[PDB]
Write a protein that binds this ligand. Structure first.
Ligand SMILES: Oc1ccc(Nc2nc(OCC3CCCCC3)c3nc[nH]c3n2)cc1
Ligand SMILES: [Mg+2]
Lengths: 258, 296
């Protein structure tokens, strides 16, 4: 409803800075690594599929995890507990019908108790000071999609697919803001499908150009090329579904020519 | 944790939890305490997670201020600025005087500011009614009980259908539209505007079809001319009686021309054409707006 589209985008641009996790946090974690986080995110993708959760829920959960781990040291046997509570929180915030706590207990395969999940929920809330309304790659993309002439369902799904892949790999995607990853993913999707480029109307809206996007674009292009060989594959399988127009079976462009 | 607060009296029960009037023993501040009993259940309720995250973002003179969140292992307490009463109780008390037009205008103006602020910060309230609109002795009115609120996206996707107290519920919800947006809160506010004028509910239905027929008998049964797409809506029925639209000077007789013009834009059928809170603040109805203290 374009009466507030501008106010809302401006406000989300303010909040994404405030909601940004700390870029170099993994370096400061004694027991966990980037690859362990990739394993967790990939599992949450599966959880989201199993329970038919919104993509927005997945993006929120990752935001909560990255922010939590930005200040809280976590041992590897407790990372899935952090992730489970984040998904439960994200579901309560975002879903019409979130899965119940018992379902969240069940999908950890009884690794943890209900009491542990609830106590972790409370801890995550404390650490994030209840600040759960975070901007996501998804919230930006959905605005950018309005600038297509005309709308292309494959552009949309492929942009979502690419934004989602960015969730898996903290290096390098933790250094980029949700609005920037979305711009790179939208341009990449659009170029892949239609040959078209980041529209002038989105330069006016975001102030981002292809130049300012380039650093993110080159990382995302590489991720896109190496996606079939990444150890984590749940996003690629999810995006084979007809719901997302099978976009993960599209061939990435060899060059971007930027 | 709650040691500095002295409970005064129970105020009531909203969407969830219980609200008390209390005073801070050290500063003297009078507060509203929202108590939430919490393990073995489903943990922190979604309504509380939403109310808190969203109210922490919304600092505005016409939105109830959340001051603090106090969070033990058993109970969660939300500390809010205290307001003196609700619009509903105030309208009941104005039984004989009626509400002076300057106060109606001021309250509407203030409510639209509150709401424009929510909507510009991607929050839908979804439960506007006289009981959730709170007034103080200084002439302020403030949106309260964000227990049913949620953050929305641009453009919207499908959200919870079971929303808004029936008397204040928009036709697009009643007719089962898969997308509703900010315009649902404007519908509610429009019903409330009419109600402040007449001091009775504009559309007091007792079921969903009753609610729709009441709206239809007042504004006309919508067709494809007035509201493109209506006849395709999930719960539209071709059997609906076809009532003629009433002239608005009859809907709210005490209202003058600028008033009726604003109300009619707030009760437009087509959500897309229904006026936004932002645009309504510049309506001619508000040219002489002041801020009268009420008559408590
Ligand atoms: O009559 C009175 C006297 C007093 C009040 N005061 C007040 N009440 C609140 O919620 C109380 C609930 C009650 C049930 C419906 C929703 C609101 C508040 N929430 C933040 N500040 C509040 N102040 C209100 C009404
Ligand atoms: Mg490490």
């Amino acid at each position: 409803v374009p009466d507030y589209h501008e106010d809302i985008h401006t406000y989300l641009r303010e909040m994404e800075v405030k909601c940004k996790p700390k870029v170099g946090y993994m370096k400061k974690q004694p027991d966990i690594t980037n690859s362990m986080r990739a394993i967790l995110v990939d599992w949450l993708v599966e959880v989201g599929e199993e329970y038919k959760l919104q993509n927005e829920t997945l993006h929120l959960a990752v935001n909560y995890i990255d922010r939590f781990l930005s200040s809280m040291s976590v041992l590897r046997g407790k990372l899935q507990l952090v992730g489970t509570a984040a998904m439960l929180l994200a579901s309560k915030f975002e879903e019409i019908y979130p899965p119940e706590v018992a379902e969240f207990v069940y999908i950890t395969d009884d690794t943890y108790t209900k009491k542990q999940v609830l106590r972790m929920e409370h801890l995550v809330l404390k650490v994030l000071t209840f600040d759960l309304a975070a901007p996501t790659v998804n919230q930006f993309l959905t605005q950018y999609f309005l600038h297509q002439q005309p709308a292309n369902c494959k552009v949309e799904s492929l942009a979502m697919f690419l934004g989602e892949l960015s969730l898996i790999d903290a290096d390098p995607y933790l250094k980029y803001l949700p609005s920037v990853i979305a711009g790179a993913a939208f341009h990449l999707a659009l170029y892949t499908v239609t040959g078209q480029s980041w529209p002038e109307s989105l330069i006016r809206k975001t102030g981002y150009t292809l130049e300012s996007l380039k650093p993110c674009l080159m990382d995302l292009h590489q991720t896109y090329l190496k996606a079939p060989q990444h150890a984590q594959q749940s996003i690629r399988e999810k995006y084979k579904n007809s719901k997302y127009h099978g976009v993960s079976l599209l061939n990435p462009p060899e060059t971007l020519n930027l | 944790s709650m040691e500095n607060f002295q409970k005064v009296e129970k105020i009531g029960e909203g969407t969830y939890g219980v609200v008390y009037k209390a005073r801070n023993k050290l500063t003297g501040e009078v507060v509203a305490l929202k108590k939430i009993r919490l393990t073995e259940t489903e943990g922190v309720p979604s309504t509380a997670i939403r109310e808190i995250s969203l109210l922490k973002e919304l600092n505005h003179p016409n939105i109830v201020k959340l001051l603090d969140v106090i969070h033990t292992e058993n109970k969660l307490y939300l500390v809010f600025e205290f307001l003196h009463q609700d619009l509903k109780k105030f309208m009941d008390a104005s039984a004989l005087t009626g509400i002076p037009l300057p106060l109606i205008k001021s309250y509407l103006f203030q409510l639209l500011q509150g709401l424009a602020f929510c909507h510009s910060h991607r929050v839908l309230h979804r439960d506007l009614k006289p009981q959730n609109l709170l007034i103080n002795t200084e002439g302020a009115i403030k949106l309260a009980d964000f227990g049913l609120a949620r953050a929305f996206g641009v453009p919207v996707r499908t959200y919870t259908h079971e929303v808004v107290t029936l008397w204040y519920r928009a036709p697009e919800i009643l007719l089962g539209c898969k997308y509703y947006s900010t315009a649902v809160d404007i519908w509610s506010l429009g019903c409330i505007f009419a109600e402040m004028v007449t001091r009775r509910a504009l559309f007091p239905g007792d079921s969903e079809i009753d609610q729709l027929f009441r709206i239809f008998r007042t504004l006309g049964t919508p067709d494809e001319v007035v509201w493109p797409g209506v006849t395709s809506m999930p719960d539209y029925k071709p059997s609906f009686p076809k009532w003629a639209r009433q002239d608005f000077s009859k809907v709210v007789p005490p209202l003058d021309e600028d008033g009726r013009s604003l109300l009619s834009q707030m009760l437009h059928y087509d959500p897309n054409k229904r006026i936004s809170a932002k645009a309504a603040l510049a309506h001619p109805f508000f040219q002489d707006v002041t801020k009268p203290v009420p008559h408590l």
